Amino acid sequence: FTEIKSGFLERRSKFLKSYSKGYYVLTPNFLHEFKTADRKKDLVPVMSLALSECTVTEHSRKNSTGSDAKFVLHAKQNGIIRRGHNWVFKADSYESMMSWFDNLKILTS
Amino acid sequence: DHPFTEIKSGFLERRSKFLKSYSKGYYVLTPNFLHEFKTADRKKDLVPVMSLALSECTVTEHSRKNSDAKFVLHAKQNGIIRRGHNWVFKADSYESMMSWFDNLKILTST
Amino acid sequence: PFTEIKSGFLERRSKFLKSYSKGYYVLTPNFLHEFKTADRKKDLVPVMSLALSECTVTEHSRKNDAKFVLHAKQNGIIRRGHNWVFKADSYESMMSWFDNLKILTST
Amino acid sequence: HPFTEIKSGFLERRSKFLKSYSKGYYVLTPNFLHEFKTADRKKDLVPVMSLALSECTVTEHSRKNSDAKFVLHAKQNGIIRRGHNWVFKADSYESMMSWFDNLKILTSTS
Ligand SMILES: O=P(O)(O)O[C@H]1[C@H](O)[C@@H](O)[C@H](O)[C@H](O)[C@@H]1O
Ligand SMILES: O=P(O)(O)O[C@H]1[C@H](O)[C@@H](O)[C@H](O)[C@H](O)[C@@H]1O
Ligand SMILES: O=P(O)(O)O[C@H]1[C@H](O)[C@@H](O)[C@H](O)[C@H](O)[C@@H]1O
């Protein structure tokens, strides 16, 4: 229940070149993935990515100034992601993506 | 790897009821979870072994002072622990146990 | 990221004036805070923050009936040994407050 | 006897009217930076002030080389006027950074 942001995101597989969706919760410590949004019964994160090991590097530009709703989370250290690898996430709109990005930028700076 | 919203951290031993022995781990309490890590290296070892949602846990009994450094964490829902099942923790002292117990209790009242 | 246990309006009785005044309260693991209003973004300064570790809850109404008593164990906002009475809109709502408080303040 | 505290210690806050630092004992929780006159966590439990983190940010801090200061900025009118700034001083650079990084992660939406 104590969080900065939560909602669905699609995470890309580099090798498979496809996306899979999960329900994410950002807290001051972790980006957690859960299979669902039911916070009372779905209690065990699929994974918890420690923010202190991550940075957010790039994001999409708005189309007019999911195509424009991506951002990249970079691993600074070996954790869930191998050091100096990157995961790409896709939110429903540029606007929602920037909400994720702007929080993550502060948390990981 | 530098900041973390930790309310309490330290080593605890958790009794396994199948293995008949305690496993020690490095635990960190946040407002949302009691996380276990294999080690205390808060800069590098940052994938939890397990993360117990406080929203579905309670703390129920503990040792009387007079080891006397144990307490029970109970599951309200099916998670890491099956609904209605209980895990027993052992801290280094009664006093340390009560620091854990009181910090958990105030985060699991609902 | 607000960690709260419960929030809502309660009326707090004055023992001497024999009247109630209403406030918007927020129970956290550490305090029962009163605010003038429910607007969490603009009404930022607690009117008072009662430390739970200095309090117990002692009695409450039986169902017909929405009152409970918060007892000061030490001198804080309330004098040691003294009591404040709170009234919530229903027995059910009152028990929600009381049951949380009982756990938070139990020895 | 328990308290969800993420960080606590003495800080000096600069008053811009009094032209001096006032020292107080501060306790960070997930909701507030509270000031108390003393460190007596069992008896001195009415905050001097409680700064809502939802409407605070941390903005600058000292470069290593006092170098133990940081600025807390107000987003809204509260115990600081909106857009005004308070300067804190902690015993060392390292301790200042522990405060700064702990605040920063709790004030990313503010
Ligand atoms: O994020 P993943 O795990 O897909 O990491 C890849 C890096 O993304 C590439 O820069 C790099 O070129 C490598 O190919 C690497 O697999
Ligand atoms: O008195 P000590 O510190 O040896 O505590 C023991 C407990 O008494 C046992 O229940 C428990 O099963 C453990 O063996 C633990 O060692
Ligand atoms: O630690 P030192 O000796 O540098 O003391 C200074 C204070 O640190 C300043 O905040 C205050 O602004 C004064 O400039 C004062 O010089």
Numbering used by the authors:
A (entry chain C): 467 to 531, 538 to 581
B (entry chain A): 464 to 529, 539 to 582
C (entry chain D): 466 to 529, 540 to 582
D (entry chain B): 465 to 529, 539 to 583
Pull text from the paper.
The PH domain-containing protein Slm1 from budding yeast Saccharomyces cerevisiae is required for actin cytoskeleton polarization and cell growth.
For the two structures determined in complex with Ins(4)P, the positions of the inositol ring overlap. In addition, we observed a contact with the ε-amino group of Lys562 (hydrogen bond length  = 3.2 Å) from the β6-β7 strand. In the non-canonical binding site there are four residues that are consistently involved in ligand binding: Arg478, Tyr485, Lys542 and Lys562. The non-canonical binding site is shallow, large and solvent-exposed, and so the phosphate position of Ins(4)P in one of the structures was seen on the opposite side of the molecule. * Crystals of the same protein-ligand complex were obtained in different crystallization conditions.
